[PDB]
Design a protein around this ligand. Structure first.
Ligand SMILES: Cc1ncc(C[n+]2c([C-](O)C(C)C)sc(CCOP(=O)(O)OP(=O)(O)O)c2C)c(N)n1
Ligand SMILES: Cc1ncc(C[n+]2c([C-](O)C(C)C)sc(CCOP(=O)(O)OP(=O)(O)O)c2C)c(N)n1
Ligand SMILES: [Cl-]
Ligand SMILES: [Cl-]
Ligand SMILES: [Cl-]
Ligand SMILES: [Cl-]
Ligand SMILES: [K+]
Ligand SMILES: [K+]
Ligand SMILES: [K+]
Ligand SMILES: [K+]
Ligand SMILES: [Mn+2]
Ligand SMILES: [Mn+2]
Lengths: 335, 390, 390, 335
């Protein structure tokens, strides 16, 4: 395995799918308008994220749709126009594309184009995301950069069960249409303590998970765990102190936390599983260069997936793993 | 007996393809003839005088407004316009059969629904001019109307996207236990998009109180229905989805009203979708960007919704030449008053270009707004500032 | 008489909604009973002995291969698998009615078509293992087969995308004056996507020699047909698009063959689409990632395509226990030989991760390939290099 | 108006729509398999780009489809799988989104995922693009950055009639699925001489249209004319020599021409009508920063559309016009 997973009242050990269920549970209990729907959600979903909710809340609030993603998102928009909370599920992020027009032309623009007479702020679209070891072209994709070029939506990716429940509760409650991408490899990979009761993590705020003084590393989702290990390799093998940052919200993103870090370190490495070209690291890199030009001691490095579709048998060679990141960091330190 | 989960059916021991019925399609429901005479007394809705007069005056006021705004576009006073000629009957017949609070989604050629719901002339014009009175804040191109007060969801240009949204809003109403229906208008062209198939199927499987209302006017821009589909119109698709369906004469206000009234009653009661296909003809160009003589008039002179309704009113003793003259005049004045006021208003503050993208304004977006402000301080002589508010 | 361009129809003077016929749906064509007896002699296709035996042996070889590869997945030797249990009859019945060169697009549960077209065991296994013999170069997940030689377009995971592509390929064949049909397989779940509506309508309006073949097996993963649609199955949608339609017993090879043969004849001759809905039942789990006891078996024991065909062969004196035993053995050996060979092959060069993204390799992509090469030179001990070619 | 529009045998004055027609004409004459289709193309199209072709080539080769963009692109893929040339039209770039799944999951991946057993290299999708003065949210969009994150397709935007015919002929003939975006404001805005006979302009190659030594300006489509004028303003008002570059191909893009220019000037300004965040200037900026770090004298500037939907009445304030670009350039020169 390419990664290692490593105040608020009572907590229980939860894996990532359980913490999604807890978030959904808390939401349906406190918001009578809230409904969950999409493909195969009724029996508990193909990743188990909705287990027991239809029994608890009723078949009118947790239900299967026909197999039509443009319909699922159009339907969720319509529910949210009435003011009801619509939690739509898209079965894999790779299958969000049939809904792209509903998301980009419709949900993102609904408030703006109506002068705020109408909105779909109460829509959240949840979708498993990212590589899984063997998902190949259509069960592995990270589409966040496609959505980052769309003013009007929020895109949010957690790195852990505690983060997932707090960020999902934030998306569900946020007054803007949100896409919540759940790293599917983490669904059943290590548990942590998660508060039983509802709590929120702020959107548009990065988290500095480890302080450092030599270089700034930025990632999101599973890749955070990859950079955490890179920090460890760098301290041990090179005596390099790394500041590790989880971006968490893709848009609108926390420009200030990133620039502040880089102003202190002078070096930045961004890493994501998505292809390099057009990937979201490009937006981060461009912006930091613009704000921290006087502070930058080395070219900003992006360690990303290659500019190919996501392969089956070659996955171990495709992903921006700890060695790829370390080497790039080594070279950036030698610059 | 067959056991398969996917269909309820018998076996047949002989190979026989199901042929479509396109030559003898679903018949077209009609209440009044082209002379405005009732054909079948038991179908007459017997609408009271004041209501029928309101249907009539709404359709001629829309027609008056269409003429004036079409001219305004030709002269470049507004950037764009789409008329509603020939389809005025489908708009007002259907809107009159709805409750005031039934939620409407449309396409762009349904302004008579808003007119029937008493949307001010000032506001139709504010949107077409993008002026300060526009509650849409001048952001969308002309005829992209919306009204929260009158439960008319803001139009957007992408065809058929509103179909599965209407279905979601209908689901929510069901849950709310609303005694409310949602109606969803689209043309025959838009019915070709994937979103139409999504909405139709979702409506039926999720059991939604919705009316799908298809204006079949024979063309999508230049494309005749013969290149749009090969089955019997839109109405014949409904049954395949499990949706109750009817086809009506879209030039007959009372046929449209009757079907809409009964669909509404039954949709709300049963939580089931109804499909109405109103057969009409697009008498104008597609829009101001279209010269329709490049691809194709009887309809205007011999089968027009407004003339038919006018013949009906005369048959009851409800209208005459004098009243027609005085109203032609009052409506011209009402429209020209709104028009002059709309032209004299400033456009909204250029600041409004940045608000409502999200509910709140993100800080990076505020920084772009600040950038514009500083830019205009230095370079403002190069911008049409004197037309814009503040 | 109505004049509207959009439909051919009469007027009706009374309001009547068209009700769908869901309880008495389109009847299900059947040639042989569950004891493999012909029901109606005039429908018997009288296929010769060698052909029927080929249908039978293709379906049991697929079944043998399914058992072995399913086990291989459970043990983690391949990453994923989907069986074809219960649907073997739809695959081979339809493939036998096609010309060798008719172009096939599928979904993922149609491997019997390739088996019937004599696709080597070695190549089914090469793809599931992603080994050096895979002409797909190990890039797609297991069961995503494709064969240019056998005119079987490479499967992709996104549901229903192949439907309007099949239609384009059929248009092109028409133009080429091919005497060739395209067939397009999908399940009842996939028929819910927007792309299905696109393909059906395009096929009818553009007059394409295509066969749409829907495997209705009662479930899309966990979702029963009652949550998938409310009309009478997929077959009842065809007529709305102007498409000739039939429903067949998908567990009856000869019913499937007969409908497919006649659709093919008529599609090619008339340049018009045909829709066949084969009613079946998905006897296995949806895939190796699915435990199907979580949402729902008679079919296996009492209405299975393979058992029915086996009863038929015995009725002609075309098979017996001895032959069944010897073939059970030969097929196990043929499959285990391919399986062992597939496991001993190396995976392709990691270089192949970069080729065919474009026809040529762009220079920036070559630079990424170079980067990987240098990376593996330094860090290669951390990668599974010894399993991969070169 | 925000812009001014300013060897190969016989030429004729052609506007941009005419040069598209000429390209299509030459293509259908020399390639018997080639067909053109989409909404309203039969009568000559809503921008007149297919006038006279159905009369010339036949109703089986120039034809209307039903009003379904996912169908149009799926259909074009299918035609191209057989080896026939499929020229699909999408009526406005704003309406390409219903086809996003067919483009991104299907056409981009068709060759790769089949091991080159199948391909749709003979597909070209043409679509009017960019602002038009009054198109508002859905007749103005520039979606190129959405497509830039998709390995497997080529995206190409011309700046003029001569460029358009040569680049479109290149796309039609290229062995990869191509999206050709035609700046609709230019359709009838100034003509130039265009060769009657077919010729090709190379894909993936920028064009330096004006040599300079102080700063590099990069744009594509109509925006090239905007930067050309900015160069002129800069020479006149500041004594600044600008190198003006038309990128032409969005992906794969001509990294070397851009880096070479910037290595000489030391300053880069990229401009596009599309929103800033996630726009393609971010990819250019990031990459140049990586290659020309030692050469860069000032932070790379991006002058783009704001991060909003494209407005109706506010268009004059939204677009990255000559004054916005000039001011940014002025400041970058003062850095
Ligand atoms: C998804 C998509 N594709 C194409 C179009 C272009 N379009 C139009 C616009 O751009 C308007 C709103 C200004 S209207 C239109 C014709 C639709 O025909 P229809 O029969 O549905 O409606 P009408 O006959 O009442 O105009 C198209 C192809 C569009 N609006 N949306
Ligand atoms: C557009 C879209 N949405 C969802 C899916 C997920 N999916 C599947 C995959 O991911 C496979 C290829 C591994 S298969 C599947 C069930 C399709 O049901 P169906 O009746 O069409 O076919 P079967 O009953 O023969 O499996 C879904 C929802 C998918 N493949 N494509
Ligand atoms: Cl998975
Ligand atoms: Cl005129
Ligand atoms: Cl097991
Ligand atoms: Cl335009
Ligand atoms: K939300
Ligand atoms: K719409
Ligand atoms: K597919
Ligand atoms: K091409
Ligand atoms: Mn129409
Ligand atoms: Mn199924």
């Amino acid at each position: 395995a390419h990664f290692t997973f490593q105040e608020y009242g009572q907590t229980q050990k939860m894996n990532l799918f359980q913490s999604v269920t807890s978030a959904l549970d808390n939401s349906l209990a406190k918001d009578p308008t809230a409904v969950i729907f999409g493909e195969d959600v009724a029996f508990g979903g193909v990743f188990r994220c909705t287990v027991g909710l239809r029994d608890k809340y009723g078949k009118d609030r947790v239900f299967n749709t026909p197999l039509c993603e443009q319909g699922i998102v159009g339907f969720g928009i319509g529910i949210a126009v009435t003011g009801a909370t619509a939690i739509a599920e898209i079965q894999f992020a790779d299958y969000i594309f049939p809904a792209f027009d509903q998301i980009v032309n419709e949900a993102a623009k609904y408030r703006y184009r109506s002068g705020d007479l109408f909105n779909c702020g109460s829509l959240t679209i949840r979708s498993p995301w990212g590589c899984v070891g063997h998902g190949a072209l259509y069960h592995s994709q990270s589409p966040e950069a496609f959505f980052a070029h769309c003013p009007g939506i929020k895109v949010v990716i957690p790195r852990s069960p505690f983060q997932a429940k707090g960020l999902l509760l934030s998306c569900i409650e946020d007054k803007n249409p949100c896409i919540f991408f759940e790293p599917k490899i983490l669904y059943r990979a290590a548990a942590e303590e998660v508060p039983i009761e509802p709590y929120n993590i702020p959107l548009s705020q990065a988290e500095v998970i480890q302080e450092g003084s030599d270089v700034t590393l930025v990632a999101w989702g599973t890749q955070v765990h990859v950079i955490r290990e890179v920090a460890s390799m760098a301290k041990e093998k090179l005596g390099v102190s790394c500041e590790v940052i989880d971006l968490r919200t893709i848009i609108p993103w926390d420009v200030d936390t990133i620039c502040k870090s880089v102003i202190k370190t002078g070096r930045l490495l961004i890493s994501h599983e998505a292809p390099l070209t057009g990937g979201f690291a490009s937006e981060i890199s461009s912006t930091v260069q613009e704000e921290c030009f006087l502070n930058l001691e080395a070219p900003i490095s992006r360690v990303c997936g290659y500019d190919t579709p996501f392969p089956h048998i070659f996955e171990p060679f495709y992903i921006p793993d700890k060695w790829k990141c370390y080497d790039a960091l080594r070279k950036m330190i030698n610059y | 007996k067959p056991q398969f989960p996917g269909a309820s059916a018998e076996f047949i021991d002989k190979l026989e393809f199901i042929q479509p019925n396109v030559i003898s399609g679903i018949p077209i429901y009609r209440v009044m003839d082209r002379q405005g005479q009732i054909i079948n007394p038991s179908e007459d809705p017997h609408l009271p005088k004041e209501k029928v007069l309101k249907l009539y005056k709404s359709m001629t006021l829309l027609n008056t407004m269409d003429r004036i705004l079409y001219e305004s576009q030709r002269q470049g006073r507004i950037s764009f316009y789409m008329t509603n000629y020939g389809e005025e009957g489908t708009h007002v017949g259907s809107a009159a059969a709805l409750d005031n609070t039934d939620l409407v989604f449309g396409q762009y050629r349904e302004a008579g629904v808003l007119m029937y719901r008493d949307y001010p002339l000032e506001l139709f014009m504010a949107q077409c001019y993008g002026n300060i009175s526009d509650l849409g804040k001048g952001r969308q191109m002309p005829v992209h109307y919306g009204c929260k007060e009158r439960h008319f969801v803001t139009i957007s240009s992408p065809l058929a996207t509103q179909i599965p949204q209407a279905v979601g809003a209908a689901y929510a109403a069901k849950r709310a236990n609303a005694n409310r229906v949602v109606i969803c208008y689209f043309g025959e062209g838009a019915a070709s998009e994937g979103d139409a198939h999504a909405g139709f199927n979702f409506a039926a499987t999720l059991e939604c109180p919705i009316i799908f209302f298809c204006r079949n006017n024979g063309y999508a821009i230049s494309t005749p229905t013969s290149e749009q589909y090969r089955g019997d119109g839109i109405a014949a698709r409904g049954p395949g989805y499990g949706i109750m369906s009817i086809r009506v004469d879209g030039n007959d206000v009372f046929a449209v009203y009757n079907a809409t009234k009964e669909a509404r009653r039954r949709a709300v009661a049963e939580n089931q979708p109804f499909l109405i296909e109103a057969m009409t003809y697009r008498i104008g160009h597609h829009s101001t960007s279209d010269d329709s003589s490049a691809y194709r008039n009887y309809w205007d002179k011999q089968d027009h919704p407004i003339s038919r309704l006018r013949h009906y009113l005369l048959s009851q003793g409800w209208w005459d030449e004098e009243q027609e003259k005085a109203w032609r005049k009052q409506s011209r004045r009402k429209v020209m008053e709104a028009f002059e006021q709309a032209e004299r208003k400033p456009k909204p503050n250029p600041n409004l270009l940045f608000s409502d993208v999200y509910q709140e304004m993100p800080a990076q977006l505020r920084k772009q707004q600040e950038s514009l402000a500083r830019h205009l301080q230095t370079y403002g002589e190069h911008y049409p500032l004197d037309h814009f508010d503040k």
